[PDB]
RNA sequence: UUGAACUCGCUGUGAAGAUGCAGUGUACCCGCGGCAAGACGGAAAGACCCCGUGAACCUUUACUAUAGCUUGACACUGAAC
């Protein structure tokens, strides 16, 4: 299937590229996510005539993501409280939803889909390092302090 | 049940076990109560047996198929290393 990329897609190409991808790749991911469109004559001519504003919007999105990442980094450390045993091990667990809620209460709005926990979901009291992905290329870090 | 009967015995003859043929013996016409030796008695187009290039249902390492079960290829089906 021939498609026109509407953004930067890793291992595929840059915006405006015309690429041949597997039909399922286009059908179930790229088009529904908005990262590409079918390479019909209408689409090709329309995009080529109306192209540059899209890079302007992509730059605006990247700048907004950078600003949000800077705010997240400036937030530094966020503290979450739960219940645990005397050994410091939590009976329950601390996940993306409540981490994002704590960050939002701290001031920066982050969705649960932007939380990236490398070593699974937190289960012990102490300090952990969590990552945030607000853009496909930028990354932020937050210290999480779990207390009883 | 019943082709029609003026519907005896014997010995023979004879699709080869005769009331009905031949020879011969016996016998006046007709009921009623009884008995079942014969009318190859009545009943059911022999069930045994064979035959038909008949039937059915059953069996199986008979033949040919086939549901099911199982194998792989392609499709729905994508990304990275
Ligand atoms: K005579
Ligand atoms: K009799
Ligand atoms: K035969
Ligand atoms: K039968
Ligand atoms: Mg004789
Ligand atoms: Mg005689
Ligand atoms: Mg009498
Ligand atoms: Mg009697
Ligand atoms: Mg008889
Ligand atoms: Mg017969
Ligand atoms: Mg047969």
UniProtKB/TrEMBL annotation:
Tell me where in this chain the PTM N6-acetyllysine is found. 89
Asked whether the keyword Ubl conjugation is assigned, the reply is no
Keyword list, A-Z? Acetylation, Coiled coil, Ribonucleoprotein, Ribosomal protein, RNA-binding, rRNA-binding
GO cellular component terms, semicolon-separated: ribonucleoprotein complex; ribosome
Q: Which GO terms describe its biological process?
A: translation
Q: Does the keyword Ribosomal protein apply?
A: yes
Q: Where is the Ribosomal protein L9 domain?
A: 13-40
Q: Which residues form a coiled coil?
A: 37-64
State the Pfam families in the record. Answer: Ribosomal_L9_C, Ribosomal_L9_N
Q: Which GO terms describe its molecular function?
A: rRNA binding; structural constituent of ribosome
Assigned protein family: Belongs to the bacterial ribosomal protein bL9 family.
- Functional note: Binds to the 23S rRNA.
The protein's name in its UniProt record: Large ribosomal subunit protein bL9
Gene name linked to the record: rplI
